[PDB]
Amino acid sequence: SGWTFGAGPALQIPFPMQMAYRFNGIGVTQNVLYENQKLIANQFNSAIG
Amino acid sequence: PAICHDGKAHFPREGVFVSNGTHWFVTQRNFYEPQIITTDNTFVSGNCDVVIGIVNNTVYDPLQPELDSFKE
Amino acid sequence: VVIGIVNNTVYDPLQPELDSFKE
Ligand SMILES: *[C@@H]1O[C@H](CO)[C@@H](O[C@@H]2O[C@H](CO)[C@@H](O)[C@H](O)[C@H]2NC(C)=O)[C@H](O)[C@H]1NC(C)=O
Ligand SMILES: *[C@@H]1O[C@H](CO)[C@@H](O[C@@H]2O[C@H](CO)[C@@H](O)[C@H](O)[C@H]2NC(C)=O)[C@H](O)[C@H]1NC(C)=O
Ligand SMILES: *[C@@H]1O[C@H](CO)[C@@H](O[C@@H]2O[C@H](CO)[C@@H](O)[C@H](O)[C@H]2NC(C)=O)[C@H](O)[C@H]1NC(C)=O
């Protein structure tokens, strides 16, 4: 549910949209993640490994 | 996540796309206020075959009917 | 419905520009 479960009732939301919002938070537009999704996922998995 | 009308992807400027079952609207995140998907609250970038989960729909144009009716 | 609204006109940049040229 992203961060919405802290304020009030939890609200379901697809994960890629959540990551798009979180890039939009730091000043990077949404037209970056929707292209580089595969690379981002690979990097995340490598780091968490 | 995106709408492709003329083979081009359209992303919201600030908000999220929502479909009630028949049409498609763009709404703000923390409150329900649907609006017609024009070309003023969305921006275009990239082709139609790079994003995942895109859908097919047309985007309203405010200038085209107004100026085609008048130019006649 | 808005409490305290006033009356005035809003200029449109496109209307005179595309009305003068269309003649
Ligand atoms: C989803 O929203 C659309 C908005 O266009 C609804 O379509 C309109 O529904 C009203 C209700 O009877 C009609 O009077 C309009 O003529 C419809 N618009 C068009 C273009 O036909 C639609 O009904 C909504 N869907 C649901 C399930 O409520
Ligand atoms: C969205 O519309 C486009 C056309 O503007 C569709 O692209 C073609 O669709 C037909 C039948 O749906 C296929 O036979 C062609 O091979 C498609 N061509 C290309 C270049 O994609 C597209 O399929 C539509 N999207 C959906 C989900 O139906
Ligand atoms: C702003 O202008 C509107 C007209 O476009 C006014 O609405 C009418 O005003 C007349 C007085 O000029 C009244 O007799 C009518 O009853 C009004 N009609 C409606 C539907 O309100 C409006 O009053 C003006 N604003 C103010 C503050 O007077």
CA–CA separation, A43 and B50 (whole Å):
19
Is the Cβ atom of B19 under 6 angstroms away from ligand 1? no
Collapsing DSSP to helix, strand or coil, B11 comes out as strand
Which backbone phi and psi does A19 adopt, to 5 degrees?
-65, -35
Nearest to B42 by CA among B67, B17, B23: B17
Q: What is the dihedral of CA A48, A49, B1, B7, to 10 degrees?
A: 140
Beta carbons of A25 and A2 less than 8 angstroms apart:
no
Give the resolution value in Å: 3.5
Summary count for chain A: helices (H), strands (E) = 3, 0
- B63 has a chain A CB within 8 A of its CB: no
Neighboring chain A residues of B9 at a CB cutoff of 8 Å: 31
Beta carbons of B43 and B63 less than 8 angstroms apart:
no
Please enumerate in sequence order all residues whose Cβ is within 8 A of that of B41, keeping only pairs 6 or more positions apart, or say none.
B12, B13, B14, B15, B26, B35
Please enumerate in sequence order all residues whose Cβ is within 8 A of that of A4, keeping only pairs 6 or more positions apart, or say none.
A10, A11, A13
Method: cryo-EM
Q: How far is CA A3 from the centre of its chain?
A: 11
∠ Cα B31 B35 B39 (to 5°): 125
Mutate: best of B52, B54, B55, partner A, most A CBs <10 A: B52
- B71 min Cα distance to partner chain C (Å): 7
∠ Cα A2 B40 B63 (to 5°): 155
Mutate: best of B8, B11, B31, B32, partner A, most A CBs <10 A: B11
Q: Where are the alpha helices (DSSP H) in chain B?
A: 63-71
